[PDB]
Amino acid sequence: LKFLQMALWSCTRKLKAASEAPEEEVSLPWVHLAYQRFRSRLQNFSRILTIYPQVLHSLMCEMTLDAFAAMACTEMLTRNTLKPSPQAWLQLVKNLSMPLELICSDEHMQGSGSLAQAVIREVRAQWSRIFSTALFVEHVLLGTESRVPELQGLVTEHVFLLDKCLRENSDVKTHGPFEAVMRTLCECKETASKTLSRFGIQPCSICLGDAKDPVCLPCDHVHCLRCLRAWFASEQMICPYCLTALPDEFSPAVSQAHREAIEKHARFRQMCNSFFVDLVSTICFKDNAPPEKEVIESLLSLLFVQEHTKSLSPFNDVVDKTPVIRSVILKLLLKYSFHDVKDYIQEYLTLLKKKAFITEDKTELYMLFINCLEDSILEKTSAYSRNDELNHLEEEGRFLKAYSPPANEASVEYLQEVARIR
């Protein structure tokens, strides 16, 4: 109640300071005006104190208690990382996300002073770090507990490594932090592979994927049953990878150990991919501004191996046999204004369309882009009000009036026009 008094008192003082007149006297009406003007901020501060009452102990003409409460929470979450228990910590982070994300938005805190702005800048870097570590925890750690409990220690260590690498500059929309996260996740997957088997995990030299139907040999390198049958036809007794003379009487079979190990490594890869995808979607592609050129270029590079296509993942260990095309990165880029993303999307199209992944009769490929562009517009329009809808319909009318029309191909501007017309 003391803190709420201080907050509403500062709001009243500020509002009266802007009264077009001095603060000769501060009457009761101004208090109601303050509540009306700062209702949401005060409710949010109350929500924060309710969720994590401990913040009060840390707290011991401008409204700033909310920003300092947020800073205290980010401190009393970076310090208590994974404590008391991973689930409680993750759940607290989740509960606080909504109020902390509100405080970190320019809309909620319009016009606050410079101390509040600097505090919010730090609270933003802190929240980015906390949220990234929390997503790593939720996807890799919790899953690892149930599926592959043997790795929980390594995942726990890498959590603090991630927190340590993101600390100084946590703007994952820039290049350095993005590469640092990708590098850390790659080291973690590599170490897990070395751990789950002292000879590691390698794909079969025939299929170069995971050794489905795993078959080991006196050389300890792994292959597949079906590939070994196809290889053993005749005159082909020796392994391909090492040229070892197999005993004439040899007969292959499956080792349960390796199939379990492979399944564990696949579950781990799946969790790490989910973490990367969530970090890109939520943290990287968040602002009202696209990430920098280097991040987008790296992401577009990750889709393809040196061509073959794969799902969005920093690991060059899974590949789609046929060149599949998917819409994720396109939807993410289209979250922003087309004017900014045109060159990225046209580079993506020219890259796919470079006989790397498609051959001819591309009418289906263009439809993919058009559909996403259509979705993008619909996504934006659903935010509009009734008068915004009328002004939109008039603008679109004068656009249809202004529209006027190379061959043998299409560009993202032509496809965006086709979508808008549709």
Binding site: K362, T363, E364, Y366, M367, I370, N371, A407, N408, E409, A410, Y414, L415, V418, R422
Partner: protein
């Protein structure tokens, strides 16, 4: 009894549409040719140069709603 049938709509409907469109009562109608067939065959004014001037890029599409999500989730 009903549920077995709905599973096969994606095929059964194009079949019915074909049988209907090719019926004499329809197969000579231009609106039907536009809806079910490719109009380029019978409209010479239609361009045929740019990939954008195909038939499918200018075809309808499913509007996404909450009901359609509900149905997909249940399936």
């Amino acid at each position: 009894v009903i549920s077995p049938e709905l599973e096969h709509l994606d095929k059964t409907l194009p079949t019915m549409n074909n049988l209907i469109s090719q019926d004499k009562r329809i197969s000579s109608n231009p609106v039907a040719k536009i809806i079910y067939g490719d109009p380029v065959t019978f409209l010479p004014h239609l361009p045929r140069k740019s990939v954008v001037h195909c038939s499918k890029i200018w075809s309808c599409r499913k509007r996404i709603t909450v009901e359609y999500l509900q149905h997909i989730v249940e399936q």
